[PDB]
Design a protein around this ligand. Sequence first.
Ligand SMILES: CCC#CCN(c1ccc2nccc(N)c2c1)c1c(Cl)cccc1Cl
Ligand SMILES: N[C@@H]1CCCN(c2ncnc3[nH]ccc23)C1
Length: 319
Amino acid sequence: LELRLKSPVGAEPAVYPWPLPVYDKHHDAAHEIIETIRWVCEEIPDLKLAMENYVLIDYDTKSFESMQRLCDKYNRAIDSIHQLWKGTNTRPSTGLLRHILQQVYNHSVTDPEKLNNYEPFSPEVYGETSFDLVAQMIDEIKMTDDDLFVDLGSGVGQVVLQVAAATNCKHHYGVEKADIPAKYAETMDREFRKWMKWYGKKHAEYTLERGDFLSEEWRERIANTSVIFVNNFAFGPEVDHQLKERFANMKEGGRIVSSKPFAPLNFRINSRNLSDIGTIMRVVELSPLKSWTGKPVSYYLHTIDRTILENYFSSLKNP
Ligand SMILES: CCC#CCN(c1ccc2nccc(N)c2c1)c1c(Cl)cccc1Cl
Ligand SMILES: N[C@@H]1CCCN(c2ncnc3[nH]ccc23)C1
């Protein structure tokens, strides 16, 4: 007893067991199946044409026969389109990417209680605000093939997967210290590569790794990173202090995007604060409210700029 969805690009079929997995009180694999079919139809106009109308209206998610009929109608339409194409790698749209990431999470994080994450930043609620704010961040910072992206404390790797599907950075890295999210990130990685191949979608290279970003090995890695992403909301003074010492080795123009600023927004260099991180970085608050109708949220963009410090010394020598 199972349900199969044929890939629109001829990759291995998606196989679901019956009874279908339940994700939460209002979300299950049956809705995921329906939404996957709809996304493929939206993406492939010939498929929308070949498939029968009623199929996506008259369905019973609690009936094996009804769900099998729905999958069969989609599969037959896939076969017709493959026959049509017989007779003579793009990035996912934002909408498709939102669906893919949720689907990857649902097939990977089967026991969300294990994460022990009760914050708004939890992987469990990533789709609510984080996905949209990360999409806004990607459009604002505009990375190229010369960039290296690193998420410090990457959880199950959701930000890394989103950024790798959307940008052309040379490489995307996620580093996570905790055992449970790092173990789940290994499944997220496998499921993401599998689903992206199933849809026929391209993504940049990425690595999700277990590790401590405060280790000796990570000092040079942070120094050589052009874009750092970090959810530093819950960081204590020691981790915060140590991380600022790591940032102090980054190159000019290096960027840090975070949930809390590492330096005051109104930093004013003087003789008493020459040791503060504010002397070598610009800091701006980015708010989608400044066609956003979501939560009134913000993130912080830091840009390594040692001319702040240089101008202070040249101003002393040039009164
Ligand atoms: C950890 C997963 C994530 C994310 C997106 N994100 C933010 C920032 C503030 C928020 N406030 C409230 C609720 C949220 N979901 C918020 C998400 C973020 C960005 Cl864009 C840049 C740098 C750091 C962060 Cl953490
Ligand atoms: N889940 C973890 C909570 C704390 C932040 N975090 C980290 N990940 C990887 N290296 C780290 N060194 C210090 C903190 C840290 C992720």
